[model samples]
Target: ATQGQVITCKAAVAYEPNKPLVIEDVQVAPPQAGEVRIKILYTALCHTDAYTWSGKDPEGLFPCILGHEAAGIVESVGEGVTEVQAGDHVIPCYQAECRECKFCKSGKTNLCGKVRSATGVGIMMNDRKSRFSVNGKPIYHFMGTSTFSQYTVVHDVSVAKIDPTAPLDKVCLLGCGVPTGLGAVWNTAKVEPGSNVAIFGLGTVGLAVAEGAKTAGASRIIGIDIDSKKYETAKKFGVNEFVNPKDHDKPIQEVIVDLTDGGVDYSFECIGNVSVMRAALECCHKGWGTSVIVGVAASGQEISTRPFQLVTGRVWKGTAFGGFKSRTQVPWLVEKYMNKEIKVDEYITHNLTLGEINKAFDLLHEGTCLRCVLDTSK
Candidate 1:
């Protein structure tokens, strides 16, 4: 039986920081046990890819495929697969599973140590092997999806099969950015209806947070950002108000307090900028607010929330990968999209091909688009 295609596909592999995505031919393998091989059609560009490109990765695995927020079709399935079959549409999860792990059994998919060694080491789960190779040197799969290419090999747990005919482009959002942001509100923070919410960095995640806040019945959903373009997108995503921190002569926190009457009930740091993170935490009024850190910052960079903030009753928390089990929660997100409860369509501004991955990254870094997607078919 054919394993990986004799197929050579274009991929964005990182060999050096500050360099462009090395666009070249890569070899991918078929599914292994507890794994599935995906025929990728679309992938959402994310700031996390920028962090990985700028040499900010703490794990430090170069020659790794850098796109994770992706969705595609299941082309092949490995042994022991029961949940999905070939031709199924699916989303790849950054946090995956090996059901045998304590975390998976306990309902904590994010903390699953099941694929730790493989993902942490930049290799394949269960086998510690790699599917992509160039000139016989192995390349690491980023966050386990690496849909930067035409295909990806992921564990069954890392994938959730959705409606096969769903617009792959729209469903792709749930693969990463949408779920990561929206989930933080409805699923993670569990924002109370009619509460006030502040979101920093109005990108895909931040905008989703704004929408999530709206869905949760927030009285005020304030969007904070330096970029003016995001204001429109933020509004589309349910931002009731916007704060251009650059506009205020005084500090942004002071402006927010003036607007929200002391502070909001919750704040979400969505930029991953350390300083902005601190501000997101501080902007909330003491004794009645919670700050959730959703963006990823550079490794080794530490954040310090003033001890007084916590002592005075401001609470700080974090949620990664949307705080939901992919297998369990993704279907609901799909339903919501179908029912028209959330917006994911208008946010995708740019589309490119495998060769244009660098351009996609450039657009993201330039902050010209709310979200960019790479379509291998393009």
Candidate 2:
């Protein structure tokens, strides 16, 4: 009934850095050409959201609706949007897959060029304008998705149409963390069966990597973290051994090498620390071990290691969105979650309404929660 009309709905707006999100009513304009308007039902808080909200991101824009990991139903579609229509279940992807873009066609990487440059700076691709506003002032978008709002508009290329039967609350995770870690292993690393795997950090993404390694039949899974408290939960996700860097006097890479009879076959850095990234790479087995960097380090931070590390045959790689083509592979991930081949529900540690969004951020900052799903309608 609201199609082709401006909808006023509640959204958590980031008006300042390091401050709480202000939940307010905002006007959502109808989808423009090649856009789709969605009514977001469930959104999950991610560290990226907190990072951007902290005002630390060099590209951070103010008075923006900040959320990317979410699930919603298509409320309306603009002209030429053939892939999805009104009432379809969808997840908005920060990484757009236009299919016609050079990167999408290359088949070597999933970094879709469609709207990337524009989205990174917070603007729509068609007219370089925002589809959101408060009263008469314009609001910026985030990562091509602003799912913090009850209603949001995204380009058709950014929407992933999923099975209607799937629960939005659970499948929403497939939009980011779960797929990122799992895809890093399955797609980027192609983790071989019987390989020994080591993971740095035991956050949601790190555990998801463990889950992927377990599913890949890794012979041993060692989880490394500063806090031993995470080890108990790590085991449930297939981490058979745990290492707390604080407990050891030696460099973590040396410790890991000593533990694995030279080094692990595969290692992953799920924490964004540049030093840890170096360790993750150095801890790999001498000839063929591959290390995947899954975490996003702060802007301007650089990773360094002796060039001989690579000269000796250890490979270092990084991934965004776990190397999955957003629109195409996200649905397949949802199917896997539905088939019980992967996990989603086990990662959710809290449920809160959109009004309580600040508490969600607090939980994330405190490292006390896995994922906090927000009910947007409440």
Candidate 3:
């Protein structure tokens, strides 16, 4: 009955950076052509969300809905949207996968070009407009997903239809963190059995990488973090050894190289620190080590190392969305979660309603939470 009509509902709007999100009524416009309107059920808070909320991101925009990891049902579909329909369970992907795009068809990367330019600047691709507004003043979208609102409209290519039997709340994490961490190890690095792995930063993404390494049969998984408290939690996710960088006087890369008799076979940077990125690369075994950067660095931040780092056979590369095609692979990830092949529940440490969104950010800042899933309807 609400199809084609504007829906006024509750949303946590980020009017400015470093300030609490305002929970208020906003008008959500109906999906335009080649779009899908989603009724977000559960959304998880990720570091990226907090990072942008902190006002550090150079591209961060104000008065936008800031969320990407979420699960919802299709409330409606606009013209030319064939991949999904009304009532279908779905996950909104910030990385789109329009199969016809050059990036999607080339199969070299999952960075679909469709709607990317518009997404980066916080507007709808088709008409360069926002689906959200407050008192007729247009509000911007974030990451092309924006699950912070009760209802959101995304390009059809950005919506992945998942199995209806899968629980939306639990599987919502597949939208970002789990897939990103797991895919970085599985797809980007292709971690082999018996490999020695070092993961910097034991957040949800870092732990997911450890889980991936464990599943890949890595002989030793070393988790590095500043907080000693994370070591205990990381152990449950397959970290066998813990190293707190603060505990050592020497540079972390040198310490890791000496600890591993050379260096780890594979290392991942999950903290988005350029200095840590350099350490992650430098600590790799010179002959054949591969370092995968899974963290999202702040804009304008650059990573640098001696050119010799690469000439020695150490590989440095980065991944977005863990190199998985959103429309195609997200559902498969959801199935993996349902079949007990991967973990989603273990990462969630807190749950709250939309109204308590500020507390969610506080929990993230306190470093006491892994993921805080929000009930959008409430």
* Worst 10 contiguous positions by lDDT, candidate 1: 1-10
Question: Which parts of model 3 are misplaced by more than 4 Å?
Answer: none
Model 3 lDDT, full chain set: 0.93
Which candidate order results from sorting by lDDT in descending order?
Answer: 3, 2, 1
Task: Kindly list the per-residue Cα lDDT of model 2 for residues 89-122, writing each as its tens digit.
Answer: 9999998999997888897999888787778878
Q: What C-alpha lDDT does candidate 2 achieve relative to the native structure?
A: 0.92
Per-model C-alpha RMSD: 2.0, 0.8, 1.0
The lDDT values for all models are 0.81, 0.92, 0.93
State which candidate has the highest TM-score.
2
Off by over 4 Å in 1: 1-6, 107-109
Evaluate model 2: give its TM-score.
Answer: 0.99
For every model shown, what is its TM-score relative to the native structure?
0.93, 0.99, 0.98
Which segments of candidate 2 are over 4 A away from where they belong? none
Clashes in model 2: which pairs? Answer: none
- Error (Å) of candidate 1 at residue 72 is 1.2
TM-score rank order: 2, 3, 1
**Deviation in Å, model 1, residue 47 alpha carbon:** 1.0
Candidate 2 backbone clash number:
0
Model 3's TM-score against the true structure: 0.98
Colliding pairs, model 1: none
